[PDB]
Design a protein around this ligand. Structure first.
Ligand SMILES: [Ca+2]
Ligand SMILES: [Ca+2]
Ligand SMILES: [Ca+2]
Ligand SMILES: [Ca+2]
Ligand SMILES: [Ca+2]
Ligand SMILES: [Ca+2]
Ligand SMILES: [Cl-]
Ligand SMILES: [Cl-]
Ligand SMILES: [Cl-]
Ligand SMILES: [Cl-]
Ligand SMILES: [Cl-]
Ligand SMILES: [Zn+2]
Length: 129
């Protein structure tokens, strides 16, 4: 059902990187594989993904560059599953790299943070069946 190097869970296929990329390069990579950065739709999917994270910060398909949080596939953010770290998202500017923080990633414990999109983090692709 899933292609080789992809993991099947509950009607999605997932691919977990062994490397890091900026958020935009990871979403380009997922799109080239007819997929997208992972969209977390439920607690059960959050638990599956967080269980197999490669012990490093990992991008997901959630960003707010135009001002509101959006999932790459159009899943509604505000009515959807959320799993932020305490005090996140904060759009922090104190990194001094310019602007705030517009891309969401997993901490190893599975809780989410907004960070600078240009950081090379691991990522997860997802595609339907
Ligand atoms: Ca590898
Ligand atoms: Ca999903
Ligand atoms: Ca499961
Ligand atoms: Ca932001
Ligand atoms: Ca952490
Ligand atoms: Ca943050
Ligand atoms: Cl939350
Ligand atoms: Cl950013
Ligand atoms: Cl960095
Ligand atoms: Cl899809
Ligand atoms: Cl999907
Ligand atoms: Zn999808």
């Amino acid at each position: 059902s899933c292609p080789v190097n992809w993991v099947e869970h509950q009607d999605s296929c997932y691919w977990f990187s062994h490397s890091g990329m900026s958020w935009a390069e990871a979403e380009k990579y997922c799109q080239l594989k007819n997929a997208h950065l992972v969209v977390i739709n439920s607690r059960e999917e959050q638990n599956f993904v967080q269980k197999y994270l490669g012990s490093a910060y990992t991008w997901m398909g959630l960003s707010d560059p135009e001002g509101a949080w959006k999932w790459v596939d159009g899943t509604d953010y505000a009515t959807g599953f959320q799993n932020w770290k305490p005090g996140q998202p904060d759009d922090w500017q104190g990194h001094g790299l310019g602007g705030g923080e517009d891309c969401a990633h997993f901490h190893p414990d599975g809780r989410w943070n907004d960070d600078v999109c240009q950081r090379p983090y691991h990522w997860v692709c997802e595609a339907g069946l």
